Amino acid sequence: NREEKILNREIGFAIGMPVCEFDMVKDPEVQDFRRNILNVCKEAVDLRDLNSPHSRAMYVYPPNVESSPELPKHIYNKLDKGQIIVVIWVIVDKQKYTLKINHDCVPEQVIAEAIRKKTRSMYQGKYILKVCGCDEYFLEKYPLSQYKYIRSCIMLGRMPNLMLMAKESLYSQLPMDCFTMPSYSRRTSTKSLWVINSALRIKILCATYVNVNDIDKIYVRTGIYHGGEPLCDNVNTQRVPCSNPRWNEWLNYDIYIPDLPRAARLCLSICSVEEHCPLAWGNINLFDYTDTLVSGKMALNLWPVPHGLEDLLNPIGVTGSNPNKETPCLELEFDWFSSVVKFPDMSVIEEHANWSVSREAGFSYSHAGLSNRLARDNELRENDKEQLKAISTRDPLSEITEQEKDFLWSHRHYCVTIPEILPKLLLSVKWNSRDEVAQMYCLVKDWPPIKPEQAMELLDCNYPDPMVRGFAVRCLEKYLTDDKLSQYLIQLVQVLKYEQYLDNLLVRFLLKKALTNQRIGHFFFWHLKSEMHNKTVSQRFGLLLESYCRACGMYLKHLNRQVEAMEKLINLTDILKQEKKDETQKVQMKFLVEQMRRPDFMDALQGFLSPLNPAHQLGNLRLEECRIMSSAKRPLWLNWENPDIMSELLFQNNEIIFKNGDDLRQDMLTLQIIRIMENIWQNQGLDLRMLPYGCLSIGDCVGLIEVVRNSHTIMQIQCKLKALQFNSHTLHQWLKDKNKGEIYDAAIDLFTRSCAGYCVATFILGIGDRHNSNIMVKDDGQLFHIDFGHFLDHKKRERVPFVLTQDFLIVISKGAQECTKTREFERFQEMCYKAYLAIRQHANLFINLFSMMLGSGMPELQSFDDIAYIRKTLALDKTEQEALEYFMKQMNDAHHGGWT
Ligand SMILES: CCn1c(-c2cnc(C)nc2)nc2c(-c3ccc4c(c3)[C@](C)(Cc3ccccc3)C(=O)N4)ncnc21
């Protein structure tokens, strides 16, 4: 118990709330989650001790690898006859050995060649390869070029520097995990829903804590929903004065109880009124986590309305009671049937489905004629098959008419042969019919596997059914690589919020992965931790974090170092940002330096892992290199030395901007999308180099941004001394001065290509207007953008954010005055055309990634109408050639010529 108490304190520190707060929660779903989730913890720990110590090292230092071993053409073409030059260092004093080897050599073979080289100058299974300058290892027998560091080196024409290291020197530094099961580990009739012959009704008793002025009459609005879809008409109570909110009114709903789907929810509000306004809203699950239909009395504390939403109900909103109990509390009563009513078992559901299928297969021509949702097997023509195929290739937010829905449902057995149509078929199901839903379940049960990218759609707010979501998860388990899981983790974390219950298949999958791959676990922790201030999710996220922190092993202690460092920076910046706001930069800096040198602060702010990338060790702070930036919120530009033995080879100092006051969630999302765009272009042989620098939200409007070394804003360059006297050639002159001689062409090429990428990316995403201060350029010509605080339809009709002025065209056309009518500009135009269509071809991915972020509280991504902006910029309703022409016209109009 002494050890457990010490652990609980550590967990409490990591999560920002004491573990005893979870102990006090009475709700049995909460206590069941805490206990039942521990088998995932056990399973993970068993995987980590399977082939110890290798398996422990693989957890801590997983291979940082691309999904596909196979290289593109333009990557392979960088290799000298499929061979790579690599430098292998040995500590003995630092001895480099330069090897020329085949790109697809395994680490063991590379090590052998390094020893063979060292031999000539005058075994293999005792060593491992480490990347020089950071804590990344090549512990697994992949092709060398599949490691991302290696593939990145080949792309950029940089020399790979790897360090030879004894296995036992690594293994020795990996403490043993001793996972201990916590204390909490040790802990009428029953009738089917389908037997209850009755309509649905619910009683609204009264509201308490209804405090108001403006407001005159009020009523309780209600509705039965499956996701965002109504299952019957809404039902209002009688009108009442706000000074006495009592209704005592049974509402009757147009739905039979046996037809209630598993994820059916009651969505209600309190409204004032003719102009109607909702004062407070709340949703609840009609079945609980044990499959029991709610019965008896219930008190629901309601939530405040968010501005932007003016609709009367909020079915997309969170489900469950407000934790703040000093809020409008509506009391409700459900119907009682002398018995516990439970949702039926799968065997009962399957039997019903088989009964229906058998029944339908016997239907005559004339019977089938009675409903467009019925078809006969023989009738299915090739023309119907083509129409189905055509419906399947439409994007996720393309409308499916009622006629198409009937059509899809009637040909649901054929839809099995085109399994990517599943999302469209599922939205065609009558979710208020048990006859249809039972058959949908049996189709889902045996549905062929779909790609993870397609499966992820089925985890958004449009697909609440647990069988559909379970199918989605099975697809990720079979087909989602750790690489792609890392890439889509932000979205996968967000869709946890749409789960009806704490314990579910998705959260079990994510937790297992977080606890078997520490690179995943790190960001899993930080994405959860960053929203613990949000009361609509803090319980779910807090309990999930608890379960992670109990089983993640030694990394908990490293996370607590990061948490303490961030907490010290939050505290310092809060003080600057309140007590010294008015003071000069000089005095603020004097205060900051004095506070950071206090030995407790100094120890907390040095010697820990970068939250932006835990492969990067942050050593001693260089206070002389730190500064408070001019910007409004007083961001800290911070500089630590990299204490790696071979830091000189990667970077000697790690520079991070810490910012306390701005919401960084949209930048973080935009940077993720840019990286995904870049990856699509690279995999297609289209080499447009982007710069998706690190950005991590760590809390409520607090986060970290990776500094891009040796870069400058456009303004600085064209400022020089010089505005009325600005000259279009100044930027070209700068780059040229920086790239004299044989390299000039490489710099112009890099500028051109990077420019094309950002032109296309920013137009597609509707990013905030570009100007000379939020466009930056590196010495080598790489152009990139910063500050992605705005996106999509943020103006309110499609803007062009990145207007190529004469400055940029002059660089592209190598100094020529008439730069719009040149060869270089034509090749640049061609790059933009290819990039644009390449993204159009992957439009469903981008739509789905945005759809998964809808239930986040990001101000410019509130509904599917915001996402519709992308449908416009990618011209998805148009033809591919019509889309090209549309893109050309937007560029043409914005540039006043050039694009035709
Ligand atoms: C890639 C991320 N990144 C950002 C950035 C910030 N905020 C958001 C939301 N996004 C991106 N700024 C970045 C800067 C940068 C910004 C402003 C600026 C300078 C550098 C200098 C040149 C140097 C300086 C002086 C005093 C204090 C600090 C720096 C200067 O005088 N003003 N350099 C690299 N990378 C950046």
**Residues 248 and 318 grouped into a single domain:** yes
Distance CA 893, CA 773 (A): 24
Residues contacting 228, CB < 8 A, separation 6+: 315, 316, 461, 462
Structural tokens at position 203: 């009683």
Strand partners for 153: none
Residue 837 lies in a domain: yes
CA 299 to chain centre: 34
Cα angle at 119 between 113 and 120, to 5 degrees?
95
Full 3-state SS string of 26-66 = CCHHHHHHHHHCHHHHHHHHHHHCCCCCHHHHHHHCCCCEC
How is 796-855 classified by DSSP, letter by letter?
A: -----SS---HHHHHHHTTT-SSGGGSHHHHHHHHHHHHHHHHHHTTHHHHHHHHHHTTT
- Protein residue with least CA distance to atom 20, ligand 1: 712
Q: Which two tokens stand for residue 878?
A: 């148009």
From the CA atom positions of the chain, what is the Rg in Å? 30
What is the spatial distance between Cα 467 and Cα 346, in angstroms, rounded to a whole number? 10
SS3 400: coil
If you measure from the C-alpha of residue 523 to the centroid of ligand 1, how many angstroms do you get, rounded to a whole number? Answer: 24
- Rounded to the nearest 5°, which phi and psi values hold at 238? -65, 150
Contact yes or no for 285/301 (Cβ under 8 A): no
Cα separation, 510 vs 473, whole angstroms? 10
CATH number reported for the structural domain that contains residue 631 in this entry: 3.30.1010.10
Residue 401 inside a domain? The answer is: yes
Which strands make up the sheet holding 297-301, listed edge to edge?
246-256, 199-208, 329-334, 297-301
Q: Which helix (H) or strand (E) holds 695?
A: strand 695-699
CA of 529 from ligand 1 middle (Å) equals 26
Beta bridge partners of 333: 203, 297
Residue nearest to atom 8 of ligand 1 (CA): 787
Amino acid making up residue 441: Y
Which candidate, 133, 130, 118, places its Cα nearest to that of 167?
130
| Residue 448 shares a structural domain with residue 499 | yes
Name the one residue in this structure whose structure tokens are 């970290």: 704
Query: How far apart are the CA of 776 and the centre of ligand 1, in A?
Result: 10
Residues lining ligand 1, Cβ inside 6 A = 627, 629, 637, 657, 667, 693, 705, 707-708, 711, 786-787
Nearest in space to 503 (alpha carbons), one of 456, 551, 544: 544
Q: What does the alpha-carbon distance between residue 86 and residue 160 come to, in Å, rounded to a whole number?
A: 5
Length of the chain: 900
Are 231 and 314 contained in the same domain?
yes
Please give the structure tokens belonging to residue 576: 């600057």
Q: DSSP assignment of 410-465, as one string?
A: HTHHHHTTSGGGHHHHHTTS-TT-HHHHHHHHHHHHTPPP--HHHHHHTTSTT---
CATH number for position 291: 2.60.40.150
Residues 377 and 513 occupy one common structural domain: yes
Q: Which of 322, 342, 362 is the last residue of a domain?
A: 342
Show the DSSP H helices in 145-225 as ranges.
148-156, 167-171
Strand 340-342 versus strand 190-192 pairing type: parallel
Q: Is there a single domain that holds both residue 853 and residue 784?
A: yes
Three-state DSSP class for residue 307: coil
Q: Which residues pair with 522 in a beta bridge?
A: none
Q: Which amino acid is at 97?
A: Y
| Nearest-angstrom CA–CA distance, 74 and 194 | 61
Residue 748 inside a domain? The answer is yes
Question: Does residue 75 lie in a domain region?
Answer: no
Handedness of CA 405, 406, 407, 412 (dihedral sign): positive
Contact predicate 157/163, CB 8 Å: no
Instruction: Report the candidate in 499, 551, 501, 545 with the shortest Cα–Cα distance to residue 524.
Output: 545
Q: Supply the CATH number for residue 844's domain.
A: 1.10.1070.11
Which ligand 1 atom minimizes the distance to the CA of 709? 34
Q: How many domains does the chain divide into? A: 4
**Neighbour order of strands in the sheet with 94-102:** 94-102, 83-91, 161-166, 127-131
Find tokens 């408070």 and name the residue. Answer: 628
Tokens of 728: 């279009």
For residue 449, the one-letter residue type is P
Ligand 1 closest atom vs CA 664: 9
The minimum-distance atom of ligand 1 relative to the CA of 716 is 22
Cβ neighbours around 561 below 10 Å, total: 16
Distance CA 863, CA 842 (A): 21
Residues 127/164, Cβ–Cβ less than 8 Å: yes
Contact status, residue 807 vs residue 718, Cβ threshold 8 Å: yes
Site to probe by mutation for ligand 1, drawn from 666, 668, 705 as the one with most ligand atoms within 8 Å of Cβ, is 705
Q: Which protein residue's CA is at the shortest distance from atom 2 of ligand 1?
A: 707
Domain encompassing residue 719: 702-895
Give the ranges where 577-724 is alpha helix by DSSP (H): 585-597, 599-604, 665-683, 714-719
Distance 574 CA to ligand 1 centre (A): 21
Residue in the structure block whose two tokens are 């961001």: 635
Cα gap 67→480, rounded to integer Å:
10
442-445: list long-range contacts, CB under 8 Å, 24+ apart: 442/349, 442/350, 442/353, 442/354, 443/412, 443/413, 443/415, 443/416, 444/468, 444/471
Residue whose CA lies nearest to ligand 1 atom number 4 = 707
Residues 330 and 374 placed together within one structural domain of the fold: no
Query: For atom 12 of ligand 1, which residue has the closest CA?
Result: 707
Write out the two tokens for 418. Answer: 């085109």
Backbone angles phi, psi at 636, to 5 degrees: -100, 125
CATH of the domain at 423: 1.25.40.70
- Alpha helices, H only, 77-211: 107-121, 148-156, 167-171
Alpha-carbon span 479 to 741, nearest angstrom: 49
Ligand 1 atom at minimum distance from 712 CA: 22
CA of 765 to the centre of ligand 1 (A): 23
Both tokens assigned to 355: 């009964």
Crossing angle between the packed helical segments 555-576 and 518-529, to the nearest 10 degrees: 40
- At what resolution in Å was this solved? 2.1
Technique of determination: X-ray
Specify the residue with its C-alpha closest to ligand 1, atom 5: 786
Question: How far apart are the C-alpha atoms of 801 and 790, rounded to whole Å?
Answer: 11
- Residues 124-144 as b or e (16 or more Cβ within 10 Å = b): eeebbbbbbbbbbbbbbebbb
Q: Looking at the structure, tell me whether residues 775 and 739 fall in a common domain.
A: yes
Identify the H or E element spanning 567. helix 555-576
Ligand 1 pocket test, pick from 585, 625, 657 with the greatest ligand atom count within 8 Å of Cβ, gives 657
* Token pair in block for residue 886: 């549309």
Instruction: Return the ligand 1 atom nearest residue 707 CA.
Output: 35
Q: Are residues 332 and 353 in the same domain?
A: no
User: What are the structure tokens assigned to 275, written together?
Assistant: 């102009």
Structure tokens at 859: 């101000």
Give the amino acid at 430: K
Q: Which atom of ligand 1 is nearest to the CA of 628?
A: 27
**Could you tell me which of 897, 688, 862 has the C-alpha nearest to residue 791?**
862
Q: Report CA-CA distances (Å) from 797 to 6, 766, 875, 890.
A: 59, 11, 13, 10
d(CA 644, CA 109): 25
Of 342, 373, 403, the residue at which a domain comes to its end is 342
| 870 and 757 in a common domain | yes
φ, ψ dihedrals at 542, nearest 5° = -65, -45
69 prior amide bond cis, ω within 30: no
CA distance 597 to 455: 51
Residue 332 forms beta bridges with which residues? 204, 298
First to last CA, the chain: 75
Residue 786 Cα to ligand 1 midpoint, Å, equals 9
Question: Do both 776 and 877 map to the same domain?
Answer: yes
* Number of separate helices (H) and strands (E) present in the chain: 35, 27
Residue with token string 């999958």: 509
Beta bridge mates, 296: none
Ligand 1 pocket, mutate which of 716, 758, 786 (most atoms under 8 A from CB): 786
Distance CA 617, CA 606 (A): 10
| 451 and 519, same domain (yes or no) | yes
| Ligand 1 center from residue 640 Cα (angstroms) | 16
The answer to whether residue 96 sits within a structural domain is no
Helix (H) or strand (E) holding 283: strand 277-285
Helix (H, G, I), strand (E, B) or coil at 118: helix
> Of all protein residues, whose CA lies closest to atom 3 belonging to ligand 1?
707
Report the atom number in ligand 1 closest to the C-alpha of 629. Answer: 27
- Is residue 182 a part of any domain in this protein? no
Of 329, 243, 219, nearest to 282 (Cα)? Answer: 329
In whole angstroms, what is the distance from residue 892 CA to residue 246 CA? 62
Q: How far apart are CA 389 and CA 776, in angstroms?
A: 45
CA distances from 728 to 38, 485, 866 (A): 64, 45, 36
Is residue 609 situated within a structural domain?
yes
In a domain, 19, yes or no: no
Let me know whether 408 and 511 are in one domain. Answer: yes
Long-range pairs of 507-514 with CB within 8 A, sequence gap ≥ 24: 507/37, 507/544, 508/37, 508/40, 509/473, 509/476, 509/477, 511/37, 511/40, 511/41, 511/44, 511/544, 511/547, 511/548, 512/40, 512/43, 512/44, 513/482, 513/485, 514/548, 514/552
CA angle 271-272-276, nearest 5°? 85
Is residue 404 a contact partner of residue 322, using CB atoms and an 8 Å limit? no
Among the candidates 291, 314, 342, a domain finishes at: 342
Name residue 802's beta-bridge partners. Answer: none
CA of 788, closest atom in ligand 1: 9
Ligand 1 pocket, mutate which of 586, 629, 634 (most atoms under 8 A from CB): 629
Any bridge partners for residue 773, and if so which?
none
612, 675, 707, 719, best to mutate for ligand 1 pocket (most atoms within 8 Å of CB): 707
- The answer for 53, left when phi > 0, alpha when psi is -120 to 50, beta otherwise, is alpha
Distance from C-alpha of 221 to C-alpha of 207, rounded to nearest angstrom: 13
C-alpha dist (Å) from residue 6 to 565, 675, 844:
20, 41, 48
Cβ 206 vs Cβ 331: under 8 Å: yes
Q: What is the Å distance from ligand 1's center to 704 Cα?
A: 12
Order of strands across the sheet that contains 783-785: 711-713, 775-778, 783-785
Cα–Cα dist 676/141, whole Å: 26
CA 489 / ligand 1 centre spacing (Å): 27
